Design a binder for this molecule. Structure first.
Ligand SMILES: Nc1ncnc2c1ncn2[C@@H]1O[C@H](COP(=O)(O)OP(=O)(O)NP(=O)(O)O)[C@@H](O)[C@H]1O
Ligand SMILES: [Mg+2]
Ligand SMILES: [Zn+2]
Length: 319
């Protein structure tokens, strides 16, 4: 666990450490102010001793990848600092909380339809969030059918943008799920992918999983790593289904039950329940949650699909 990082003495000179914005398995993530720029960062602190007591390879991979990636929907990793006991990762700070922190998705009992509320989250202790909170006024905003599809489509555009980029960089993510996306702020719906712990470069697959709800059947049905990045497109489809329908398509009582449903369940988007979706949403869902890998969309095809693209590629300015 050596990352060729700077010294922690340098870290404490360069950054002013503030309050926690999360806790991982190996330490906290703290807001930090870069002294010379006033940039507000997240510093992820990981205890090397606790790591060693498997995740070592995953961590080196996550760090090496996030450091080299440059995309507006992927959290940047700027700098690494370390000593014998700690790794400190200076990254882009997301103030808005997890996808499902801000988006409240549930089935409305009276109509049987999925409902969505947007929540103003109170997670970040940074100076900017502090300032806005004490000067401002607050809640839960309910979204109609049109608002929901527009917002969800926008979310999916960002997820597929990130995936297209990743796949073209030759990286399979393998853990696309709501928890791994954070909102940049409370002021917009910009999202960032913040976790690469299970990621692998294509050229290393088979060189010697994910959260069950979101894992593709071909991943579950393969002894080794003989599968492609369309596994990520499937995971994104599962995320989309949850956002649109209020529940995952394979809602097992436990992991074993979930794995069986993913493997056995042929999704039929001609079940009358999907009448609640626009024809385009229905069609995008069916093309992401296609068990036939050859036929399933990749990120590019998802991006070109009219549910995502229909307000783009215009000629005359009609606004
Ligand atoms: N760039 C960031 N900006 C803001 N918050 C972050 C950032 N990165 C991580 N966090 C928060 O820190 C928490 C822990 O990070 P995480 O990457 O989950 O560590 P972990 O040990 O992998 N825990 P888990 O993923 O649950 O097994 C996350 O839930 C985020 O809410
Ligand atoms: Mg993580
Ligand atoms: Zn903040």
């Amino acid at each position: 666990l050596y990352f060729q990082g700077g010294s922690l003495l340098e870290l404490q000179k360069k950054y002013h450490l503030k309050g926690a914005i999360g806790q991982g398995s190996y330490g906290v993530v703290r807001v930090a102010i870069e002294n010379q720029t006033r940039a507000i960062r997240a510093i992820k602190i990981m205890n090397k001793n606790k790591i060693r007591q498997k995740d070592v390879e995953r961590i080196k991979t996550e760090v090496r990848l996030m450091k080299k990636l440059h995309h507006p929907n992927i959290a940047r990793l700027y700098e690494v600092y370390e000593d014998e006991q700690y790794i400190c990762l200076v990254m882009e700070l997301c103030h808005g909380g997890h996808l499902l922190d801000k988006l409240n998705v549930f089935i409305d009992d009276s109509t049987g339809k999925c409902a969505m509320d947007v929540v103003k989250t109170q997670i970040c202790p940074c100076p900017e969030c502090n300032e806005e909170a004490i000067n401002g006024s607050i809640f839960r905003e309910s979204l109609d059918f049109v608002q929901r599809e527009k917002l969800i489509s926008n979310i999916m555009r960002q997820i597929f943008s990130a995936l297209h980029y990743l796949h073209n960089q030759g990286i399979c993510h393998r853990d696309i799920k709501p928890e791994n996306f954070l909102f940049s702020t409370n002021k917009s719906f910009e999202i960032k992918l913040v976790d690469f712990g299970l990621s692998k470069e294509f050229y290393k697959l088979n060189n010697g999983a994910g959260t069950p709800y979101f894992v593709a059947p071909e991943v579950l049905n393969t002894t080794n790593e003989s599968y492609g990045p369309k596994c990520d497109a499937w995971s994104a489809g599962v995320l989309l289904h949850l956002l649109l329908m209020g529940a995952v398509p394979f809602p097992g009582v436990n992991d074993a039950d979930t794995i069986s449903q993913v493997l056995n369940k042929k999704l039929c988007f001609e079940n009358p329940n999907y009448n609640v979706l626009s024809p385009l949403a229905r069609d995008l869902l069916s093309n992401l949650l296609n068990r036939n890998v050859d036929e399933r969309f990749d990120a590019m095809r998802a991006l070109q699909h009219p549910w995502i693209s229909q307000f783009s590629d215009k000629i005359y300015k009609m606004s």
